[PDB]
Amino acid sequence: QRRHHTDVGFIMDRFVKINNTNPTHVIDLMQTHQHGLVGALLRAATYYFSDLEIVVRHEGNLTWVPNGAPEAALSNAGNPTAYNKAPFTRLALPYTAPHRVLATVYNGTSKYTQLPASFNFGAIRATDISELLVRMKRAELYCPRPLLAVEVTAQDRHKQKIIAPAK
Amino acid sequence: QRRHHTDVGFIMDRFVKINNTNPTHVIDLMQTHQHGLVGALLRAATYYFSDLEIVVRHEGNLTWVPNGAPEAALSNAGNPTAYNKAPFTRLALPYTAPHRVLATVYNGTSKYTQLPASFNFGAIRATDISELLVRMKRAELYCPRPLLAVEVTAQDRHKQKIIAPAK
Amino acid sequence: QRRHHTDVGFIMDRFVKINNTNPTHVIDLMQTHQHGLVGALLRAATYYFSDLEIVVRHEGNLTWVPNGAPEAALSNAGNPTAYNKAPFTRLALPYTAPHRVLATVYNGTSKYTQLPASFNFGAIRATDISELLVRMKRAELYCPRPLLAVEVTAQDRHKQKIIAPAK
Amino acid sequence: GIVPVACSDGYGGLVTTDPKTADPVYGKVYNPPRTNYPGRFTNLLDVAEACPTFLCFDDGKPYVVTREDEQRLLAKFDVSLAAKHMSNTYLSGIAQYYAQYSGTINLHFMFTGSTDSKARYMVAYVPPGVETPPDTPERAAHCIHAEWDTGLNSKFTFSIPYVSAADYAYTASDVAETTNVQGWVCIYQITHGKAQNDTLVVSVSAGKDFELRLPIDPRTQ
Amino acid sequence: GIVPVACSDGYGGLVTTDPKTADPVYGKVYNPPRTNYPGRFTNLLDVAEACPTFLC
Amino acid sequence: GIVPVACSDGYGGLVTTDPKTADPVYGKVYNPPRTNYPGRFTNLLDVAEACPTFLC
Amino acid sequence: ETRVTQAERFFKKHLFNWTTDKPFGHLEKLKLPTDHKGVYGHLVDSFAYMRNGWDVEVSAVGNQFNGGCLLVAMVPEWKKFTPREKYQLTLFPHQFISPRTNMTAHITVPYLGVNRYDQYKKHKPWTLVVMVVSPLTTSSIGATEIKVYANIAPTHVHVAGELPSKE
Hints:
The structure is cut from a larger assembly and holds 3 copies of chain A, 3 copies of chain D and 1 copy of chain G. Chain A is mainly β. Chain A has helices at about 10, 35-45, and strands at about 15, 25, 45-50, 50-60, 60-65, 80, 90-95, 100-105, 125, 130-135, 140-145. Chain A has a 4-stranded antiparallel beta sheet with strand order 1-10-4-7, with no helix packed on it. Chain A has a 4-stranded antiparallel beta sheet with strand order 2-9-5-6, with no helix packed on it. Chain A is globular, with a radius of gyration of 19 Å. Chain D is mainly β. Chain D is built from 2 helices and 14 strands; from the N terminus they run βββαββαβββββββββ. In chain D, strands 4-13-7-10 form a 4-stranded antiparallel beta sheet. A 4-stranded antiparallel beta sheet of chain D has the order 5-12-8-9, with no helix packed on it. Chain D has a 3-stranded antiparallel beta sheet with strand order 11-6-14, with no helix packed on it. The longest helix of chain G is centred in the N-terminal third of the chain and has 8 residues, at about 40-45. Chain G starts with a strand and ends in a 5-residue tail after the last strand. By secondary structure, chain G is mainly β. Chain G is built from 1 helix and 10 strands. Chains in contact: A-B, A-C, A-D, A-E, A-F, A-G, B-D, B-E, C-D, C-F, D-E, D-F, D-G, E-F. β1 of chain D pairs parallel with β1 of chain E.
């Protein structure tokens, strides 16, 4: 057998769209759709570490402040500012969280269902952002969790149409 | 003598148009014209192995799901999505059919004149596709079949006019 | 500990905007904002030395005369003149001041609150200049000076809103 | 002069799975060490193999109870990753994102009955041949099958062999292709002693040579 | 600085038989083996020599 | 022929902290020597260590 | 940091009463650490940062004439489960409790989390999970009910930052 296509480092190194995007966006990997390929296989682990490449389609200049930077630091060009080219911009962001690894489920809070605010990869700001793609590089997953398949109501199985070249 | 031009890996290594294109197309090497160069030299073999390179002129983003993926998997960007550039999109696809080699003639059926629906290279989808070219890389052909020349009705030979520099 | 991010040759190696730009601009590093990252760390030294790389957004040709050249020498093409490309112009300037190092504060004058006029990297002239960025290469600092943080009026601490991925 | 280059046509577009990297924007960032962090898995099939998970029988329970009827068929279910009885399985969860599979699938049985009750069982696999599974407990002895009795060791493992035409098989059972797609496994109760409500729990794990091939994102988003 | 390049004129067009390969879209796919598959021919003239056919 | 290249999408933009250098416009400029210039500091945390400061 | 040896001791606990009317999926949890009335409670309230694992032992008192099965597992970063993923709780470190074969389980886990040290007054990484796999069945000669017990102890406790008294 050749078991390379189930590799965690190989299955996560693809671009996944993040649906909810705002003029000021805090890059959180938990915002991916829970039923996607990368989204679900990310939920199927408790802890994860990864770098992150972002492809952002924006108007105006894009500023990325790392984790822990104040919100007001997004208005300055000292932080890495990308001047927009024609189609979009393609950067490589590093791991900037204080913790050694991040988490997908948290049991409790962090202030003396809602993950702590320190679970993010930074923030990005521009005049507006139409689309945003995040790519996890050298990913690693820890503490596997239940991964659910689609349910069957009353049929014998799941009855899906496979692509066919029939004329 | 030097038979480098009659090689089976050389003559099949060229782009060929596939006349029938749809918004959602299932790439089948049997959809090539039967009388073309590569089309006829492909019908002149029973089983064929090849990779594939496609040149697609489309509008919008082009998604390619491998063989066996459901039709509903073409509406998600997790599958390889190519963003449209100016002239067209030139990709290289792998061989994804479960069978060891494909076939051009099937003697019978496969469900408990029409080849099995599993004989394809995947599917591609966009808003529309204007043209689609396919190129066979490292092609291998097995079990030669009759190859037919053009018939001549009543004249002694087939009289075709050669390009001439005559002024 | 990994003290790479407080290196003086690393923190000062980034593009910083210079607000006051004119059709004829004399490149003075002291024109940087005092509270900027690069600006404040430059104020936190007495002397410095640096090469320079400039990103200039201009209309028409940009001419750069080195330090010590007359002002009327900016109207000729014998000096390095850049023909404007589409987005902007990015050059590399050497160190042209006669002194061994520059300074950020001067005690007195230099003619038989205002640094000597020789404290510049040259001048640039074009039909107009909309933005100018400068970058210190191989920068070095000397004789550290007081560096201030923001003050607190009546709170226990400075309360600045950190970026949060909260939904 | 300088190097002349040819701006090729059709190349350079963004593919959401290209093998090329991006330009770094924040260099020399060293992350806190995560050496010897507990519980790291680098393959989804390693965790699939290591952790068998329960099946879902009728009414939604992971065990098959003994029946006090003439029917000696305790239960039967499809052998595929998209059946009802595998719908709550981690292996089914992994396989739903892949187009083709190949390899063995093990089944693990556990007896949870009282000690003072003894019983004998037989498990059978039927490849896609005969038009109806051998319901009778004798007709099924001609298939690939195994038997195990109950005692101190209440755990028994049975491996479903991979038999099909193609080298790889679809994990996404087709709308077409009615009738038995590939296979069924049926559990037979050879005998039972004072077992009216004694149960038997069935769990399924990926085999040693199981393998999934083509990643896809087939769920609706 | 960086590498200066000259975007030559007349090059870069698609020719349906150019010898350059495309950028892979789905990497590291291992196909089922087809070792010693019966009846494989690498040259059309080899099968032209091998099997004579009738005249009309 | 010549070497083909692919004009990648999304790259090439200017980020204010990219690690690539620019093309020189004035070659062979040799600066006045600054050997053994007093009080050179190469790390901010070094001068943070060596120079304690008062509280308020 | 220092390691304490007096806090690593057993602590009996009552989980629930295993009856016959509880069907499959009856889930009982016990987040760790619980209310420790011994040295560990003083450690929690008199030190801020601590890290430790847990060795959980679980015993059900009954007899061989009863049937049923209990799955005992230690879920990191516990979260409520809908009945669908209750079939997948074998993914976490686990053992089975069934009166036919075994009588006592034994699970050991390390310390794990996003922070190198945790304050368990806020975060509870590990969690005891016990469920009925098969319902308890009894006859005229079997026990009508079974009481299960917890047996737990912190392992490899490491602490830093001692806190003052409260008197």
